[model samples]
Every structure is written in structure tokens, then in C-alpha cells.
Target: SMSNRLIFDADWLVPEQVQVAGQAIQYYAARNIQYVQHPVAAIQVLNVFVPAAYLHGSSVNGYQRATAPILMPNTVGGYLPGPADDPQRVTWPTNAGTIQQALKRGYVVVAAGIRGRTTVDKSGQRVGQAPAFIVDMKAAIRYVKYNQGRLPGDANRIITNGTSAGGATSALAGASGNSAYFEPALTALGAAPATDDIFAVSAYCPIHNLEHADMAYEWQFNGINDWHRFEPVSGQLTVEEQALSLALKAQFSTYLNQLKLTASDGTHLTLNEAGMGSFRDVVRQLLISSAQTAFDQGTDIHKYAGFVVTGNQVTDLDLSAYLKSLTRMKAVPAFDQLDLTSPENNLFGDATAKAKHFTALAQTRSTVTAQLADAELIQAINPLSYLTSSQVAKHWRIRHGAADRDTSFAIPIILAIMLENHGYGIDFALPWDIPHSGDYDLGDLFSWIDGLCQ
Candidate 1:
């Protein structure tokens, strides 16, 4: 069995120490431990960073073997391969990176290096495509859970965290736990016969729901036709590009209605041609709340004239004008590019092909003939599909920066809404004036982890 095969070599780990958030902590560092039996790929390795049970002759952060939480933070971005983080040298501007912060908080940190869209095997086989990244992440989780008592921390308290594409995978890791849909992929990778379910998930600016992101993007920025900048490929969008955006935005009404989501007040959240008034109000309330937070902090949000602030409260806001001020980050058909060149396009690619369309619109709009993405492949990568299923994490902390233009803000908002509707405990918010980044708020995030793990 794969579980029996993964015997941790205590000698393979080296003792190390570092200072994090003004606290010195001793720890053990293990690097390049293969998470899978597959011989074809180097991207399947993982690293472990465990804080010493005691530091300076005292229990580290008041945590012992039985109490500490395990933190699994991946460094994936743009659907590209990311190396396992080295805890010894890991640092961040505000405090420390997620791993260091976890160590400081007396938690075990496991950083896994997973193959992404561009990874290829030694024989030139495309081993890291659509479902590959998520599959590898699940395998890593299984590895940790399988070791159970052998590992320093409690496997049941595992928490996953990542940013952008990594954040998307992190959410997938939490949502698709123990689903039979991923069993074949895990079995092929020789995953340990253990549960992949995580206790909680922390995602920041996740670029997810690829098959539907374009419509969501257009829905969020439809009328804001002035394209400031488009990523991957630059320059202003043309007339046809603007038309595509409008069409995609129009398609979003159907998708939004299908979700059958409701606002916190039990109002049916629908976005029909009559107008997205109810849904817009729900989203606007979030922005208004974020604005009030900023206003209380003495930040001059007076620059956004569209907001009507009265006595420290954002009473009203012009959702359209506010969205226009944020600007657009991606070109028309953001995720599934018509030309089959978006990062998401490559994400759905196979070993034999470098990139393909993941949406019917993209397939039909492609300059060259292209086939629609495999239905199973699309389902495997979307966290929404898992949320609708029985397999899902109980706790979630989902965040996206208000200033981030990477994907439509609607992506994470919809994710949180759906998860919340499914009865998951969610700590979701859009930080005011932040950007396309993650792991910035270690203080609050660690607090959330403590609340759940304790």
C-alpha cells in the first residue's frame, strides 16, 4: 500500500531555527520528499517544516505534539509550477509568509510542490494539465493524513492556503475531499489510502471557475468599456472585443439564475434582464462594509465620489461607476480566450496539445478549429461543483482584494455565497485597496486557523 510505502526518514530532516514576527523559533526542515511514487515528474515532491516542540527551554507558542495544527501552503501561480517553500528563508513584508507565521503560531507547515499546466515528464509527456494540479494536491494531503501518528502534528487539523491559481487549487483541495470523481486520478498517482479532506481552506484572490470566469468578468465590468490594460496580451480591447464582453455578460444572467443562490436576507439572488438589482445590492453591501472599515481607519475614501457616506456609514454606492473605477485586468473572453492563448486555455491542455478551449464560446470563436474541454475535466477543476456535492470542508476563509483586477471580484464573492448556502462556516471579505496578492494578513488568518484548530 502507498501508506506503508511512505516511511518518513527522521534523519533526512535537518534542525534549523529562525525569527518570525519578532519571535525566535527553532524548527526542523525537510526538503524534496517525494509525495508520489511516480518516476516521471520532479514536481511531485513536498517539503515539511516543523517547529521544535519547545524553544528556549519552553513549549513553543504553548503548543505540544497533540495540539498543534498542520498548515499546508502551496506556492502555485498562473497555473505554473511552483517549488516547495523553504521555511528557513521564508519571509514577508508585513510579518512572515504563511509557513513562517504558522511556525510562529506553533503549527506544523507542509509545503508541496505540484506540477502545473506547463509541466512535462522526462519523456516529454504532459503530466501536469487541468486536473493534474488538483490531483497532486489531493495526493499530498493523503500523504500527510496517511502518516497520522507518525507526523508531528494532528492530521485532522490540516489547513490549506494559497494565492491566485494556488488559491483556486487550495479551494479545490478543501471542496473536493474524498469525492469519487478524483479517485481514479489519485489511484493512478499512487496516492495513500487516506482521506484527503482538510479541516479548513484559506484562499486569497482565487482565480477559479475557469469555464465561467469570462461571463462573470463581463458581468462585473460590462459597461466599463474603457479597457485600461489587459493581461497575458496587452493593448486596448477593440469594438469586437467590447461586443464579446457584452455578450459574455449577457450569458452570466443565465448562469447566476441557475445557481439559485440567495442573499443573507433570504432574497432570491437573480440577475435577469430586468436588472441584477437584488444581486447587485447584495454585492454592494459587501463593498459598502469594506468602505466603512476603511473610513474608520482614517483612510480618505472621499476620492471615490460615487459612494454616499453619512455619519461614518456608506449609505449608498453607484455599483457601476465604482466598478468602472477599478478598471479591467484581462482582455475579452478572459479565461477561455478565443485565440486559445489564455493561461486557463493552457490549463485545460493535454500532453499531446499545449492549449485548448475550455468553453463552447471559445471553441466556436477560435481562429483555428478546437474542441470543447472535456466535461469531466471542467467539473474536476471547479470548486462550485464540489460545494454542491456532499464532499466539502466545513470551514473556509475566502478573501479577495478590492483593488485586485486579476479576475472579476464576483468569482470569490460567488464562491463564498455558494459555500455559505451549503452551510459551511465562512469568513469571507474583500479587503479595501489591496491588490492581486495573498498571505498579506497573517495576523487575522492565523487567528482564524487558531479558532478552527482549537
Candidate 2:
């Protein structure tokens, strides 16, 4: 089993010094926002802890700040469409664990939340957007800097770190590059947005682009039958047209419209009873269309996909109608501003030339090379980019696992982006026999961070 010592629980402590009353600390507001009153009225102090093995020098003592009377911004975790106490909630382990690690390395960590999650308003809208989260992080830095305490440095050299989505947020905060316009939630907080550049950032699997097509598909179109579920497709059509054809029997309605238009040409068009039926029947046909379309798309992508596309047919009748309905000529108002010609839609690629596409033309070596490049992409945005060699260096680590094919298949494009602007000390770590979400080398990550600290 891989060592998992990095995870832990949050512990609150009482300061042993004099404190003030009625300081108005830790207030929650609407829009997923929370604010803590300045603790200048009380004794400000830092806390230090040693790891269980520290006595034997096997591990080192970690230091952290005594709990401050502060509330997290809702954007930190509250607005997730689930229970209020989602594991992501700022309880003990997740947010604080890595902060503790920083403490062990002679640093103090301050966990701040923005408006979004638990700190929702009367309508339950927490500060769920990215802009709001940025606001709180910037505010926390200022609050710590101006306050009188033995705290993390208020100036340059501060390093922000997080894992998963948190990692992405940290990176965004650090990479925002002193641009105040990037702070979306500042107006909501009624505070002027800060325009300070972050010193450094450490992220683990940060999501750089939320506007990507696949990301939209995952957020909107995954497993849904209605065409309206697709942001890209719905965005393409006029709002009125999108609203009309988005019905369950939208494709059938389209077929009926075409048939009606053709019937106007003087021929007695007798339609099949199957064609003129209830919304349920229309939905059935639509499902079939959707499945076949998906199968065809799969075939188009790769002829030997080996796995089953979908389940049954009738239950999936809306599938085909869904597919047909997506390409209809409707006047939808919501999609008026969408640009249908960008490269995201592969507009420049040769439609007739099947083998010339990047997906097809890429040789195994080229793909490997691209993946290697992408693994290094993080270096460009990494705070350590300043320390890298002027001459680019190449290093590789191959990871093998049960779903290696699926992982490898999806990683190349991202790898290509990473390699495009190489910076920092870029390297790849490929593991063997690792399962989904199971293989990780925290020690390697720790070493990387340690090197940056040095």
C-alpha cells in the first residue's frame, strides 16, 4: 500500500493568552461568503506540532497557526448540489492537512473560503463561481499581512498549494498575474479587489479550462437524452428554436414538419401510424436514433472500440430523435451569440479526409512525445519555472495500469499543451499496475515542493 500520511483531521485549539470580546469575528453572508473580524483585539499566535515519528528523527515537527476566528467563503465548498457537510466542507483533514505539511516545513498556512458553499443567502445561493473564490483568497492574504501576529510572510515568497479542484483554485490565484479584473467575486463582497501577484503556486491536477467542450459535455450532456442538455448544441441554435425542439418528441415534430412541407406538394402523403403517435412513441424513436448515432460516432472515431455503446433500443428511442433534432433549423434565441466556426468544433480539419486528422495522423512515437510534452506543461505555470535551465531537458516516467489505454488516450492533448511552453523542472511519472484514482506518489510530490522551497 502507498503511504497516505498526508491526510488528517482538523483540530481547534484555545489560545493561552488574553483575548477581546465583541470583535465581530467569523460572520457568514449570502453568496457563499464568510468574513472573520480582525483578531487584533486578541493575542495572535502560531501553533507547532511534531509528527508521531519526529522524536526519533524519522520525521520532522510541523508548525501551524492556532485557529483563528474565521469563516470560509462559500465558493470554497458550500454550493455543491449535495449535503452541506460534503467531505469538501472545511472540516478537519482535506484543507488543513497540506497546510500542516507546510507548517512542518517551517511555514504557516491560512485556509480561506469564498462565498458559495455553506455560506449561502436566503435563496441558498452560495458563492459558487470562480470569481468569488478568488476574492476570498486575496482577502485572506491581506488580512494576514496587515494583522499583528507571527504569521506567514505577507510579501513575495508565499506559496499556495492544494490537491484536485483546490489545486486548480490555488493555481488560478497564483497565475492571475496581478490582474484585478480576474477577481470576479470582489464586487459581491463589497470590497475593492486586490491586485497583487502571487509568489508561487503548487497544484495537483488543476482544471485549467472550464470552457472546454468535453468539460461542458461532462457537466451538461453526460447521460441525458434531451438535446438541450448539450450546451454546445443548444448554444448553436436560436433560443426560440432551441426551446421548441428541446421537447421529448422534438425529432418527430421535425419529421412531421418536413412531411407536412412535402405534403403541400400535391401528393397524398399517407404516413405510418408509428410516425403519428404519442410523445412516448416519439421519445422511443428518438432514443433509438441517439444510440445508433452514438454507435456511428464511436465507429467514426475508432473502428475497433470493443466495448458496447449503450443498453437497449426502445428505452433509447429518444437517442436517434435526439441526434436528428440536434441538427434541425430552429430559431432559438439563447444561442444567438455562439460562434459555430471555431477550431473547438474542428472547422479547419478536412471533413472528407478521414486519416489526416490529428487523432489519426499522430504516430505512436509522436503521441508518446506529445504526452511527454504535456506532462511538462505544468512547469510553465509552476512557480518553479524561474529556476529551470535555459536549455530544455527531457525526462519520462511510464505508468501502467488496468485502464492504461483509457488514461493514455485522454492524456495526449493535454500533454501537447503542457509541452508547448516548457518551464520549471518538467518530468513525467508513469506508474505500473495502478488503478483509477489509486496510484500516486506523494513522496515525489513532496520532493518537488521541497526542491522549490530550497
Candidate 3:
């Protein structure tokens, strides 16, 4: 019937040229190959790129074809489709983006186009849903690993990267490596029977922990009613929405203290009944560091930063003022909307239903239907639940912009802390003045990858 999905076909390539880091070089491009044996959606495919040096068994960046790490960066955003990136056709900011820069850095770049929330088949049937994205990614990674020596790069050193929704998916792929949690889904798709474990993951501003996202959002923006920038039309929340906000915020306090997390110095990361505690102080330190960086870089440090400089360095920025500066970007029940309109609501949709509620608050507050997503499915998609128990990636790099209001810092903060608690190597930071974006600092990302993979 169709071509064997398990085969790598290393000869499948077309010579392509792209400029990176101020130089033009030839690279081999393999476009649009299926990753699963029984693909359910049209987007369940991947693209592979290799450096020119690979052809002659030569070394680039001090690594031969057999040693270069496999860099898999997803294009999925907002729970939407992410077809494999094409170096010959995809547009870049100047002349290069992630795919090109990654190739230049002497890594075998793999772009696996995952079936997402909106993925559809030729017959107009909805195929991509909750577990589809990660299942497809797991299958793709297995395919590459199954091929092993046939592929140019070292299958053992696979690294996944993404941002925002993409970052969330990246975390899923990284943390759930070789776990039985996704067994049935992967088996149904006829994925290659190979270990899906990866070496590292780089997530930028990942929007994860959906079950708690609404609660965390309200906690971050409890009383701020002004929405001048995000949504001017509805500049203020209605009275009913305000009450919901307070409820969700309080729920977050219950959630945080129960986690039993501790700071690096062993301070119990617990929040008081009023939602203020050691955990809040940890976030304040992150803000203080953000303001200090912005001030040093001549960003005209705004008073909203809530920091006072002494000896040209940020001394302290109270947590309350820092929270105020980052005005809320979402309404009550930010993620799982009351009317089932949020992208995440669609992400948890079933094959028959287009959208459904994933959180208890949303299901209780549904304005249209009382449908709640499958509890098992909801837990399957959240990476936070598996970080400690699953076979997680050993090396991690995450970045969440300090000024980004798309999501609460608690999401990434807890993610990093949890990983560190388990002794995983995670290099995380709140990049000053940046926003909800990905692959902006290719230099730093590549350097991190190089430090370990090389």
C-alpha cells in the first residue's frame, strides 16, 4: 500500500541552500515523510535536514554525522496545526529562523508535523485531538530511533523544542518519554516499537497545567479589572466574573500549599490562607531580577516594576507591585472558557464533539453544556503530572519572558522547580522585557545544546 513508515530512507534528499550566522551553506532537505504506519491525519509527517558535511563523513562543529544531536522543534501554536517547516519555502525574519540556524549549528534538525486540535483528514473527518499531538511526536521520535544508524544523527541524543502551546507540547514529549501513559494511543496509530525517550527539551513560555491554568491566572490577576491593552471593548470584568476570579484565586492557594514544594534553600513553598507565602516571595525574586536586567540595559525602568535601585542593581521589587504591572491578559476562567470558546477547550475535544470543558470550574460554570472532558485524558495531556514519575529528559532549558502576560509565571515556575526537585538539569530564566515568543535567542539555545550534546 503506502511506503514503509518505519524506514528512514537516508537517500531521500534535495540539495538546498540557506544563509545562517552570516554565511550561506548547502544542506540536504527531506520533505514530508509519514512517521506512523497507519497515519490518521494528513499532517502526521516529518521533515529532516542535514549539513553538507554529513555526506563525506566529515565533521562540522566538531561532530560527525553519527554524533550530531537530532533537534526537533515544533511549529504548533494555540493548539493548532504545525506542518513540518520547509527550508526551501518557509519565510524567516531576515533570511534565517530556527530551522536554518539549527542546521548551521551542526545539528541534524527534524521537524515533525504533529496532528493537532484542528487536524482533519481528506474525507473531512476530525482526526487530531487531545492525545494526537504527543502521540504523533512519540511515534516520530520512535521512527527516528528505530532507523538509528540509517539516519545521519545520533538517535540517542534527540532534543525537542517549542514555545507557548508548542512549548507545552514540547514539555509533554520530553517528560512522558517511554511512559506507559501513552501506550494505547501510540499502539493504535501503529507507531514504531522503539523507545521514545529523548535527551533534552527546550520550552519557551510554555502554557501548560491546563487544569490549574484558570486558577493560576486568577491568582496572578486577582483584583486588576483594567483590560486596556488585551481587550479594550470589555475593559472591566462583570460583577459575576469578579466573584469567579476570587474563587479561582483562592483555590490556587489550596493547590500551591498542598504541592509541598520547597525552595533551593529548603524553604517550604507554601502559600498562606490569604494566598501569600514563601512561594509568592520566590516569584518576587524573579521579578526583582527581571527589573534589574531591564534597568542595566537602559529600559527606563518603570515605577510599575516596584524596584528601587541601590548601587546600580535592583534591591527588591515587592511582589504586589510587580503583579500589578503585568495587567491581566485574560478574563475569569481564562483557559477553559464558560462558553467553550477557548483553544484549550477545543484541544480537549473528542472525535464526535468539537469542544468540551477540561477543568472542574469550567464544567460547573458552563453556559452552554455540562460536558466535561475525560478525566483520564485530561491527566494524560498534562506534563506536570509525569515529571517526577516518568522517564523525563535529563537536560532541560526553559525561558519565560518577564513581561509576557499571556500566562502566569506560576506555570513555568512550578514546572522548573518540580524538575529541579527531581534532580533533572534545568536551565530556566525569565528573560527581561521579552514577550510570548519562541526561538528568539537562537544563539543561547544552540549554545546550551552544544554544551551538552557536543
Candidate 4:
């Protein structure tokens, strides 16, 4: 009988040396370890990279088995099947990937390949859907925790990082730790019976809050309705697109009012019927701050004539022109399109069905017979809903690029604000002029990890 206990098979891991972040480092590489006892699912595997003990030289960045932090990074994007990142040949879209950097820093790196919305079984069953990805992430965490002392690094110091959809999943994994909401699913999959809580979460340009994303996108981009819009699937614009955009924009106020959030200055952060209010100003300040950072870094501000840059400070900013300059990336009702073709539409899809609407407004307007997604499934994927109910990570670092129009800037900002309201330590920022990408600031990221783990 196979023992339930996790056994580290030394034969599975191979010793390899590689150059990371301009430094030579030797590490042990373990590839394709199954995290679950599922029947014939190819996406259940994970990989681990551990810094080799110093033989001739000093320890890499002072990390050792007893003192190192674990870096659990994912490669999920666009809710697609995320294969385990190759630790040896890892690369990021914007900057150096986390695996190499973490290994160089002497941190244990574990990369998991989880099923996604499009995953199908041999029997043609749609198994990977809404909450499956999150469930898989939790299972991976449990696998690490179950091994406990057998794992090289301190399991308690597990920190998660990802970009976009992966970022959203990492946030869900961080925020929804040990919640009973996932127990039935985890039990069904024979996941390692261990706590899924993490020490910290680092999310970059996370595309989350799906049920409200359409409204939020409209609220942010409604003013720029005249900008050219293209359907995500067809790449053609129709007349009704403008109407849908305005309609969705009009619905944002209701959602904002329901949240009842407060600004940093204790003012009610409500959007008026026209989607204008103190909340808009709050977002504007984020953009202004991002611009100021650029100006201070010797960025050529000659093109941005609308801003009054006084030495190292931005005294005045024209929010309207700034937004216009950034441009809108999607059509009205971005996520939950009436045509049922967005990536998010597929994200809420199940085995039997290819796509479904998760929002009420979209359902009402959808051209096809809209099957509303299960509320439990929707809640499971949203980190915001779990912030207060689940075991929250003590420390969080969230970054949504200012120029990124993929999802509203409000998404991550609101997430951070809610987490802060719940008394969690948050290090949040909007990087100046960055797009929908991640792993841009390895220096600050490692520094923060050092501060927390030290």
C-alpha cells in the first residue's frame, strides 16, 4: 500500500547549475511530481528548485535549508492551463522570472502546473473550470505543508507570486487559506490533508473580481466611448457596442454603493449615477502618483504637457487627458460580453458547457441562452469575498500597472483597500507606465521577502 505520508525521492531530483540575474548558482531540480491522486489528469504535476549547499563558495545570497523562504510562483495567464515553469529556462514577459531570482536569492522555488478553464479529461469531461484552478493551488500548498520538515525550506514561509490570471489565483490561494468552502472539492480530489495557508502573497496586474469586472471596466472607460473598440473574438465593432458600454457603465454605481467602501481620508467612496464621485478622485490620485514617480526618475515629461511638474513633485494633473492618452483596450462590457466570447466567459464554463454568464446584467443581455454560473463557484474564485471569512495572509504585495487597461485599476486597489480594512499588512503600488505584465521589480520584491522572513 502507498503510504499517505509524503516521501522525498532523492532519485527524482537532478543537480544542475545555471546563471540567474547575472550570478552563477548551483541547484537541485525536481520535475513533474504529481500533487494529487487524480485519475489521468496531465495538469496535476509540479516542480521544485532548491539551492545546492555551498561546496567551494559561500551560500547563494545567504539561503540554506534551515533559514530560507519558499517561493511558490505560478505561470497561469488568461485562465489557461498553466504548465510548470522550467526553472532552468524561466523568463518573464517584462523582467527576470521569479524562479531564477528566488533560486539565486537562496529561496526554495516550487512551480505548479494547474488545470484551467479549457482543460478536458480523456472521457471528454470538462473538469477544469471556475474553482478548479484555485483548488489545485490549495492542493499544491497542502503538498508542501504535508511534507513539512522533509521539504528544504521553511514551509511556514511560503510566498506566492504570479501574473494576471495566475496573480488572481495566487491572491485567492492566499486569501482563501483553510476555508471550508473548498473542503468538499479538496476531499473529492484526495488532496493532501494539510493547511493551505501562506505567509505572503505577491500579485501583479491580477485580473480578478470577475462578476463585477464588466461594470468596473465601463465605469473606468465610459468617458472614452469614442475610442475604437474591437470584439475580443471577432475583432469587429458594432453599433450596439456603444449602447452596451453605456448601459454597463450605468450599473457600476449600484455595485459601488453596495460595497460601502471608505476612502483613505474616511470619506464615502461612492460613484454617483453618472459614475463620478470621490472614488474617481481616489483613482486619479493613484495615476498622479505614478506619473510623479516617472517624472522623478528623469522621464521625459515634455510630451505630457497637461501635468505641472515642479522639480520632483506633480502639482497639477489633467486626469481627462491622461486617461485618453492611456487608451482603452477592450469594448464595452469587457469581461461578460453580450456575445459570450470573452476569456472570462470561458473561465466560468463547466465540463458540459463551454461558456456561461456570471453577472446578472450580462445574463439579461446575452444573445445565447445564458446559464448563470453557480454562486458558490463564483465566490470560490473571488479573493475579495474570502478576505474576512478565510485565513488571510499577514503580508501582501499587490501591483496593478497604471497604464494597464486589461482590467480596471480599481480591481487591485479595491482588493488592497478591503484587505487593509480587515487589518492585513499591505504593500500596494501602481507602477508608472507599466502594462499587463509581472516580475518587473525583483530588487524590491526580494527586499520585502527578506524583511518578512528575517
| TM-scores vs. true structure, each candidate | 0.94, 0.39, 0.95, 0.93
What lDDT would candidate 3 get against the real structure? Answer: 0.84
Q: Per-residue lDDT for 1-454 in model 3, tens only?
A: 2456578777897788987567997789888888887888878888899988898768889878899999988888888877877666554311127778778888898888888888888888778888888888888899899989898899999999888888998999888888887888888888888999999999999989999988888888988876534335546888888999989999999998877788888877988777888898888788778777778888776747477778888887766676678666778778998999888989888778899998887888789874899998888788888864568888999999987888899999999999988789999889887877888888999999999986
Cα lDDT, model 4, residue 295: 82
lDDT against the true structure, per candidate, is 0.82, 0.31, 0.84, 0.80
Candidates by lDDT, descending order: 3, 1, 4, 2
- RMSD of each candidate relative to the true structure: 2.6, 20.1, 2.1, 2.8
Residue-level lDDT tens digits of model 1 in 25-67: 6788888888776534787888988877632334556566656
Task: Count clashing residue pairs per candidate.
Answer: 0, 59, 1, 1
lDDT of 4: 0.80
Write down the worst ten-residue block by lDDT for model 4.
Answer: 228-237
Q: How far is candidate 1 from the true structure (C-alpha RMSD, Å)?
A: 2.6
Candidate 2 regions off by >4 Å?
Answer: 1-96, 117-119, 122-126, 145-150, 153-155, 187-195, 213-440
lDDT of 2 by residue, 251-305 (tens): 3333333322211124432223233333223223323343354455443311222
Instruction: Give the candidates in order of TM-score, highest first.
Output: 3, 1, 4, 2
Name the weakest run of 10 consecutive residues (lDDT summed) in model 3.
87-96
Highest-scoring model, lDDT: 3
